[PDB]
Design a protein around this nucleic acid. Sequence first.
DNA 1: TTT
Length: 1026
Amino acid sequence: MGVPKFFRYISERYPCLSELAREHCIPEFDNLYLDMNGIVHNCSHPFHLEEEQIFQEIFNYVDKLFYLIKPQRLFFLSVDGVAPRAKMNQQRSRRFRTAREAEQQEAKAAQRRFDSNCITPGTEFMVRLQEGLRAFLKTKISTDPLWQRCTVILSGQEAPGEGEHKIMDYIRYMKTQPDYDPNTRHCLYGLDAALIILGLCTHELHFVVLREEVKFGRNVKRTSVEETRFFLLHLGLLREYLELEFDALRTDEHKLDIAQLIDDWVLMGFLVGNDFIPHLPCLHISSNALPLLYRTYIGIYPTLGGNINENGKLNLRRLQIFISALTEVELDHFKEHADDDENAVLLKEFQNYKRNFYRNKFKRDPNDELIEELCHHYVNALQWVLDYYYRGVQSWDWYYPFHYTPFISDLKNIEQVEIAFHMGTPFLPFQQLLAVLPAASAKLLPVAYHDLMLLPTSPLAEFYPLEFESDLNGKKHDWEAVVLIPFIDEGRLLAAMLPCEAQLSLEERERNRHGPMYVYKYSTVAQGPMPAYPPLRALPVLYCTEVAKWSHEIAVNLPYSVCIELPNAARTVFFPGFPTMQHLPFDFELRNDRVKVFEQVSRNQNIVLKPRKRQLEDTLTAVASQYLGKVIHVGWPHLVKAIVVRVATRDQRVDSEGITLNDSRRFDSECKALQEHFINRMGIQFANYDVLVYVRTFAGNSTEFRDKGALMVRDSWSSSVTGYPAQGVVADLTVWERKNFLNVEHYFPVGSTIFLITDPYYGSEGTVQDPRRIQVSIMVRPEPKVNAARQLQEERDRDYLSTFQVCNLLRISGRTLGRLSGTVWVVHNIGLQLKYPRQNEERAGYCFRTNNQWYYSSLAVDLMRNYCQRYPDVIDFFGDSNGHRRVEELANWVRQQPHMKVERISCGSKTVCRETIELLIAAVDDLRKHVKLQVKPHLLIKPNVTLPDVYRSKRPVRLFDRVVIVRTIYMVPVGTKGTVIGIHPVTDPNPVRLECVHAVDTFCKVLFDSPVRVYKVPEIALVIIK
DNA sequence: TTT
Ligand SMILES: [Mg+2]
């Protein structure tokens, strides 16, 4: 996996659409919508933890997400509540699955614990979680200054409806409001198809979808918070890429109605497969589904009155036409996997396949009555889903009452289909629980119905099969497998609940009501005390307010869908976070250039964008004339502000200082580089690279200080200079950006912290006293002697052999050293796991790589010798190679030893041994003078304001360097001082930003003397003490 | 809940 198949697909068909970015590349947002069931799953059962632990970790998760994304206006976190029957059927399927998969995996314990099905609403678990969560919001917002300008909304298991859909509802409600901002930048947590489709159908302009790369789980690889990156999808581009795909639907010289088109595309996306209906065998993404629905639609389009999905409502005639068209696809799928006048033969065999299918797999006779009710229920289904999205739930009771899908060929007279579902109401937690849980998890229910789950007398015993069969329509994985069970009739079920209900325990009786969502807002006025809750410590005073809002204060009742295209919004202007391909006249074509967006090269086609040859003559003097020294926007459509510092040609090149000659070789090389990037990753094709432009990316606003006189404010550019083809330069666009300081004193208030950049105490803590130069008091502190520790390390660094040397000492082939020292999978792992060549990793002091050659330390060698001594035949195998019990034996022998306990790290990073760490720690132990001075303003770091380019060291950071923290860094408060014990580079795997492509950021495993002991920290938040 |  790594990422959903849908995400993967549309992400490769439109290369510019998605990226893997780090904390700082994520665009600014007003609203973050966080969906919790995923998280709760990650934290509860990835081995043992108690509730306290779990909650603590969930809380953490949230904290780090909010910390990294910094939603400026709203933070809506939404836990799945009691959902409509349509979903509940599937929820139930997944429960039964997990229960049985659970028993099966516990069976390995027979060969030789936290029930997860409690992640559903109504369970004592989820309730306790709800509590702890409100408590958490209250603490965080009440204490943390960063959660105080935000508005926060929680929607718990209390409030009914899928998290993702409660989010949706709040969004539509939002659009409804009068003085609502059409430009609000929405960020939604998640990558699966449903959330893409969802955000895409809100018809919101600045909407991003994102999820972290690695669950926070790989913390056994020591990753700083700031090091974590996100996969993100830009809906704004998705739109433009569809506008590109259906260009053939244009009949005149003018844009198609994108609202109209998006709607229909939402429809296709729903056809590919959704939760609330069985999937059509003939439509899987890997199976080229989207392209097929595209072809079908395009080729059918001139015939429909207009849209199949009009503003969330279906056009049964047009629908009909479409499905009719899909018949081809379906029949072709049949013709393909059949074996696992010709046509006529095909059709007879296919009709026979139908009959036999209805009979065998549908357990129903093929009466035309059957086709009838199948068509009925299917069309009903579709409309139901569209309502779910465009207008909110329109039926809590309704559900597709079959386990399989109709035959497209057998869908005629759709138009005659009557659609009528009724709202009804969401089930009470216990009802839904009994509807969803399998016999296995009876415990999660109150005692009152345990009997109902497990006593074969039970009226509902049918719905609780000890054994349930599973059909897999050519779907490979057990999870894709259909789960053949009954469908609960609400009647009989509530009938079999009547007696028990009264007898429920008091607290059980109380926890069985639906509930509201809560709105937290930081208050200056003290709101009183809060009790503690495992694991949140108690609070003497709250500084926030919690306020109940019910499901119906968010309700929008109208004939049309508010999921319309707000016209107040500005799509002419550029917003920094959000790319558009609009500002450049370009042609386009769908080609087969094998673009590389993820790990490996795409196997299918993509859309190549081709900017039209610009009007500016492609000469040096001409390009310079226009753009030299000017402020432009490069990268496209992922635009950035930048200033042109040089223009170059294979022959010559212009600086502010005049024209000179240029290295042809180096130029042609740069050009190759650019070409490769754009085509292979960006699916972009410029006319030519005859003339390059070299820019500096905008790097923050800078405040200059003018003598004793005044405060100046200017633009700040970058350190590094990157090259961009002159053909992709876009100039003079207007942008929507957006609190200046006033007095010098306003900048430097009394008692605020100041850091020194002047030689006498480069890196000294300080405090401003009087803005007159500036009056300041510096707190001088001693610095530990590290020469000793350095010395220790140098000798250890000496302890290293070469791959060959090591081959000789162990008397083994080079190959066998290769397999032995890496990871070798047997089917289970049996490699000492010291090096990870493909990954580009190395294990601590054991392995290390320099001249593209490997070197192993002594611990490594004694280890490898050990392995050899003990397990010879295995080695013999490694050497001569290109009851299942011995494996487990050595797999464990290996997993046990301590090199596993030692951190693995990326190659090119310098580390240190625990002994040296000991010496250092001892020195700091051993170590345990305010000086007033007048200091020019530009040599003072204001902790969270000053741009890091003013304090970046002219020399790369080194080990044992003495560092102090300026910029705030998650756990570590500013001011904390320490010494470097690690230096770790980091490069983006596949940057879509040409500027980032080979940029390496530096993190430092730092030993702060104070406990707060050790943390990786970006070089940006550091000064070195001179 | 995801794959
Ligand atoms: Mg969901």
